[PDB]
Design a protein around this ligand. Structure first.
Ligand SMILES: O=C(O)[C@@H]1C=CC(=O)N1C[C@@H](O)[C@@H](O)[C@H](O)[C@H](O)CO
Length: 316
């Protein structure tokens, strides 16, 4: 049994606040287990922890390119499907080393006072459009936005033309104030320290709810899948499977979407929600046609080479 906290690593800020309300606190109440949310999730951190042999994280939230790299390096425990019992979660989300629990869009957002007529992906990469820009911390999401912004059709994205994408970012690189994580981006929006960003739909909508006079579009947006995974050598690997089972059920999945504008993988969650929530999701036909879906197969094969270039690229 659990004699200490079940440690869950995520992204912090409003998204972790949402996960705590929908998954962490309800599981703690249902199981009697102490659940502690932490930050730092990512492939580099998971690798360092697992390879050290000093594993302090029991459950991780992994975005599909980070998840792909973790699987490739044998950093995760296989999911116990005798424990994770969710026939209403499509089999393609129920993978060997992780369970797809959320579908999320990454969108172009603008401050309405600086840009009342909005910003298109073409205008984001236009040197003549003046404004403090924030791009994501890694090459993932960033490269696809640069390419769609430069006129690459969403259907023609992969294999990513990395050279072109970087030459595209090069046009507005002097106006890019940072390459930040989701929590840092939401704080910059709320503090009015940026004018144009590329961030998670839920982070944008939560900043607006909190008073940020910002807007966004689905033009050049990138949709991705978020996974629950268990680091290899996790001290509470068996309890982690019990948390994952709980979290992927219709009620916790619907509670997540209620608080933050990210979509469920459980097919029975949306009928529990306001019909209007469907319009703020990447799968919505009017939204889907304007952007693309991240290809994790491409990132699985190309992440290491792209990362080696990206690190040197953002270090000027
Ligand atoms: O935390 C969020 O609201 C969103 C929703 C899931 C997710 O992975 N998020 C983070 C990404 O949008 C992004 O911040 C990413 O981790 C970095 O760009 C590093 O690749």
């Amino acid at each position: 049994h659990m004699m200490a906290d079940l440690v869950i690593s995520s992204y912090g800020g409003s998204f972790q606040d949402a996960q705590t309300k929908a998954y962490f606190d309800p599981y703690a109440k249902a199981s009697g287990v102490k659940v502690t949310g932490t930050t730092g999730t990512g492939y580099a951190k998971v690798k360092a922890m697992v390879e050290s042999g000093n594993v302090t994280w029991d459950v991780i939230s992994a975005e599909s390119p980070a998840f792909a790299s973790e699987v490739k390096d044998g950093l995760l425990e296989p999911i116990d499907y005798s424990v994770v019992k969710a026939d209403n979660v499509p089999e393609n989300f129920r993978t060997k080393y992780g369970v797809g629990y959320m579908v999320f869009g990454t969108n172009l957002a603008w401050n309405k006072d600086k840009f009342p007529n909005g910003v298109t992906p073409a205008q984001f990469f236009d040197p003549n459009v003046k404004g403090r820009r924030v791009l994501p911390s890694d090459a993932t999401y960033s490269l696809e936005f640069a390419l769609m912004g430069d006129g690459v059709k969403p259907a023609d994205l992969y294999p990513l033309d990395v050279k072109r994408a970087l030459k595209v970012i090069d046009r507005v690189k002097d106006q890019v104030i940072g390459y930040k994580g989701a929590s840092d981006i939401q704080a910059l929006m709320q503090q009015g320290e940026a004018d144009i960003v590329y961030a998670g739909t839920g982070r944008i909508k939560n900043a607006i709810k909190a008073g940020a006079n910002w807007s966004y579009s689905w033009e050049g947006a990138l949709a991705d899948t978020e996974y629950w995974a268990v680091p290899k050598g996790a001290p509470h690997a068996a309890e982690a499977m019990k948390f994952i089972n709980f979290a992927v059920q219709a009620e916790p999945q619907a509670e997540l979407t209620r608080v933050i504008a990210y979509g469920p993988t459980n097919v029975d969650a949306l009928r529990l929600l306001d019909p209007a929530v469907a319009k703020d999701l990447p799968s919505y036909p009017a939204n889907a046609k304007l952007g693309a879906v991240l290809n994790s197969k491409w990132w699985n094969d190309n992440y290491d080479a792209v990362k080696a270039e990206w690190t040197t690229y953002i270090m000027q």
